Amino acid sequence: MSELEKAVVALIDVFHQYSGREGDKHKLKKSELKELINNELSHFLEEIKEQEVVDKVMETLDSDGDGECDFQEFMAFVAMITTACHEFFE
Amino acid sequence: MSELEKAVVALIDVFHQYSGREGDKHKLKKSELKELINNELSHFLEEIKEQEVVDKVMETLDSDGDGECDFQEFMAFVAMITTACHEFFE
Ligand SMILES: *[C@H]1c2c(ccc3c2OCO3)-c2ccc3cc4c(cc3c2N1C)OCO4
């Protein structure tokens, strides 16, 4: 497999490390999204310590309105937190 | 860095390896998208040998209608072609 295919499989793996913990095993509820951001995105985002901050993050990404982050919405979230990076690649 | 972060950076890096070849350096035109799929996604997708297949993939990815695949749209494309994987992580 290519570097790209290995990165995609790695992305899916970590998403499931969090979505599979509670309730719907294929979506992140707020407590799972909080842990993923704090444990795994520490270079891209500030640690979340307040409930109101997690609420807003979820509200900003939850495009279909079900209260949870599915894989499609997570992938869009990954794109949003990378916006500043592209200029450095060009 | 975390496994997720390394994977995200790898995804951005391969996108730009193709998007930076011609024209808009931050989007994939049809030629760049075909090249990326054929060279980097050969486990997830069949080799593209027909113009109709390229046209259809671009049409399906291109949510803003500019004829090119930007990074957000690429993240959505990655999520689409990996749907069969998820059941292996629960
Ligand atoms: C984006 C970026 C990265 C890490 C953390 C971040 C952001 O935006 C805010 O939080 C990141 C990681 C790695 C690279 C590697 C290379 C880039 C840009 C990167 C970023 N950008 C700065 O350009 C070439 O290699």
Ligand SMILES: *[C@H]1c2c(ccc3c2OCO3)-c2ccc3cc4c(cc3c2N1C)OCO4
């Ligand atoms: C997703 C899958 C893989 C290769 C080609 C594919 C798909 O779906 C459409 O075409 C793939 C590669 C690697 C892994 C690794 C592990 C998974 C699932 C994978 C897949 N699925 C089947 O679960 C645990 O590790």
Ligand SMILES: [Ca+2]
């Ligand atoms: Ca869950």
Ligand SMILES: [Ca+2]
């Ligand atoms: Ca949702």
Ligand SMILES: [Ca+2]
């Ligand atoms: Ca281009």
Ligand SMILES: [Ca+2]
């Ligand atoms: Ca587009």
